[PDB]
Amino acid sequence: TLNGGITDMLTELANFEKNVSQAIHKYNAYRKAASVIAKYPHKIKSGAEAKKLPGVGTKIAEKIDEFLATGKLRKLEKIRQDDTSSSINFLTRVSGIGPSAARKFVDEGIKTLEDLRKNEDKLNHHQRIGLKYFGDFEKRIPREEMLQMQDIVLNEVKKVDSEYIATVCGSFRRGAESSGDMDVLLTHPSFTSESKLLHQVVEQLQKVHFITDTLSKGETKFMGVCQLPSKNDEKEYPHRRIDIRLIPKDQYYCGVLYFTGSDIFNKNMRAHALEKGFTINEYTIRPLGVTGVAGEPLPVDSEKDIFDYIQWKYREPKDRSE
DNA sequence: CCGACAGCGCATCAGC
DNA sequence: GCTGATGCGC
DNA sequence: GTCGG
Ligand SMILES: Nc1nc(C[C@H]2C[C@H](O)[C@@H](COP(=O)(O)OP(=O)(O)OP(=O)(O)O)O2)c(NC=O)c(=O)[nH]1
Ligand SMILES: [Ca+2]
Ligand SMILES: [Ca+2]
Ligand code: NA
Ligand code: NA
Ligand code: NA
Ligand code: NA
């Protein structure tokens, strides 16, 4: 919005650092900078102004000054005209092709979707599914479709065993008008820290032809593809990414809190937890002893139990953007 | 000045 | 056959 | 690239 030109530039530099440079911490630095700028309530007018924000340092302030004076960044222009950097960058858009495989393909003259399709033999199973659904995976999911997807998953899970608990987390649980994918957290009273559960559920979703493809799957984590059924004369829906994570029941609501997010919120809640003598991670909340030693995990029967320990007013998922 | 920067489940590969 | 390292997505 | 110890 106010600073969309700047945040595009920084996101473009981030993707380059990750995909071409293979410099994951510079990618994250650029993303962190773009996220604080996108949240700033003023149209930035200088590099110096931007450097006041956390995560923006000298180099990005100089890039902002150049962008503001000229409307472009020379570094980006050279990157965009570099065929190797652009080909590597494009290929990483396939799910399962990362910076390493992208660079490898491009070294041997494999640079286009068409090249991938003629070189299907050289792709692993995840990359093959990424290629198959290349356009669909980059489409967003309207909330009304997420709602329909929730009803299918929740119902079929219930048909396998009435005592499963399944929760759709991610941006959907925070009320987003659209989501990138579907995140399902699953548990069962029979699965604890100290004790086919996932397979049964996946198989059922396949039998009703909801789940169409499998990227990866083990005893606790399923990553795959699903699609809503359409009516006879309608256009078919896009295929969608869906993950299902089976979490032990004594860690479930810590799981739910973590996978709901958002990232900033989790961070701010973990910061506050320490301040009160507790430490939270994706699995547990533990009390901190006088010297700093983490104690045993506390009992957590609900998401609100976690806020109670750290004497926090319960935040509705709708309000967990920060 | 310089090391940290999140880290885990699953797939795949190198090595034994 | 197995283990441990690494790519990958998140 | 940015931060902080
Ligand atoms: N779905 C998912 N999320 C995470 C991270 C946690 C922490 C983050 O605050 C929360 C939301 O992350 P996610 O990438 O799922 O994005 P979301 O907020 O759902 O946006 P979108 O994916 O575009 O709908 O999930 C994972 N772990 C590490 O990133 C993971 O493996 N899968
Ligand atoms: Ca998500
Ligand atoms: Ca399609
Ligand atoms: Na700054
Ligand atoms: Na990719
Ligand atoms: Na996503
Ligand atoms: Na350095």
Instruction: Please count the other Cβ atoms lying within 10 Å of the Cβ belonging to residue A8.
Output: 13
The token duo for A171 is: 């941006």
Domains and CATH numbers, chain A: 1-82 (1.10.150.110), 83-139 (1.10.150.20), 140-258 (3.30.460.10), 259-321 (no CATH)
Closest C-alpha among A288, A195, A300 to residue A254: A300
- Sort residue A71 into left (φ over 0), alpha (ψ -120 to 50) or beta: left
Identify protein residues whose C-beta is within 7 angstroms of any atom in strand D.
Answer: A 25-26, 28-30, 33, 53-61
The answer to whether residues A186 and A180 touch, using CB atoms and an 8 Å cutoff, is no
Q: What is the DSSP letter of A41?
A: S
Helices and strands (H and E) in chain A: how many: 16, 9
The token duo for A22 is: 């293979």
Q: What is the resolution of this structure in A?
A: 2.1
The token duo for A264 is: 């900033």
**CB-defined site of ligand 1, < 6 Å:** A 170-171, 179-181, 183, 258-259, 261-263, 266
Method for structure elucidation? X-ray
Is the CB of A25 within 7 Å of strand B? yes
The answer to whether residues A310 and A273 touch, using CB atoms and an 8 Å cutoff, is yes
Separation in Å, CA A167 to CA A20, A96, A131, A222, A259: 37, 26, 29, 15, 10
Q: Which amino acid is at A297?
A: P
Question: Is A270 labelled a binding residue?
Answer: no
What SS3 class is residue A221? strand
Pocket test for ligand 1, best of A168, A245, A259 (most atoms within 8 A of CB): A259
The answer to whether residues A306 and A254 touch, using CB atoms and an 8 Å cutoff, is yes
